[PDB]
């Protein structure tokens, strides 16, 4: 069964590119990472930093999670990310996304030993 740490890598890590390389990136990646299987995931963020750098955020500034949990951490540096947002024209199973590049601090919830991101909470 997929671990929470491996789910976070599948849903939110793309160290392969430094930024979204085209206007189709979210359409391709949302489908490729299985985020459009049973419905269109409405929003999702991909992080274009090394797995090591994103895992290190769990050692950085501790902040509250949006759901009230207190095991979230905010990256000390901005990171290259891509925000994926379903378009008004998207109809499952033909899910369609707007791709927007950003450079923002990320906030993740961390769990486990090793203590690693298991949830992407926000970017600021």
């Amino acid at each position, epitope marked *: 069964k997929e671990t929470a740490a491996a789910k976070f890598e599948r849903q939110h890590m793309d160290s392969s590119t430094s930024a979204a390389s085209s206007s189709n990136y979210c359409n391709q990646m949302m489908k490729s990472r299985n985020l459009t299987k049973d419905r269109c995931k409405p929003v999702n963020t991909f992080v274009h930093e090394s797995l090591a750098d994103v895992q290190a955020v*769990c*050692s*950085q*500034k*501790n*902040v*509250a*999670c949006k759901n009230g*949990q*207190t*095991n979230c*951490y905010q990256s000390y540096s901005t990171m290259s990310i891509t925000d994926c947002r379903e378009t008004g024209s998207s109809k499952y199973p033909n899910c369609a996304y707007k791709t927007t590049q950003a450079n923002k601090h990320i906030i993740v*919830a*961390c*769990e*486990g*030993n090793p*203590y690693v991101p298991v949830h992407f909470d926000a970017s600021v």
Partner: nanobody, 121 residues
């Protein structure tokens, strides 16, 4: 990286008291939650008490509620456990934990090496 320096463990008889102390060193920000966990020989590790860096939001394990009192220096990465009315069932290694959520061990990222507490009959 960060060190959680623990002190205050010892050996006492049932009914006695002990005080555990923990200070996190080298963290540039403030751990919102810090707390105490314990692990007895053969048993699963369990949350004992936790609280937020403002001095509130205290949480206690059902078995220590009324006997143990957690405190912190407000706004600082310290946490303390006053342990009174000690029972043999409280014998365990006690661990400070920093940067986590409620008493959910897997949600805490920094752990001390542990301080042994032994309560005799």
């Amino acid at each position: 990286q960060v060190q959680l320096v623990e002190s205050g463990g010892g050996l006492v008889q049932a009914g006695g008291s002990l005080r555990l102390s923990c200070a996190a060193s080298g963290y540039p920000w403030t751990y919102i939650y810090m707390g105490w966990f314990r692990q007895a020989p053969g048993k699963e590790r369990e949350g004992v008490a936790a609280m937020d860096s403002g001095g509130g939001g205290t949480l206690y394990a059902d078995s220590v509620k009324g006997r143990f009192t957690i405190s912190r220096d407000k706004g600082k990465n310290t946490v303390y456990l006053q342990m009174d009315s000690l029972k043999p069932e409280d014998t365990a290694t006690y661990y400070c934990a920093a940067g986590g959520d409620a008493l959910v061990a897997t949600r805490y990222g920094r752990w001390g090496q542990g301080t042994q507490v032994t309560v005799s009959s």
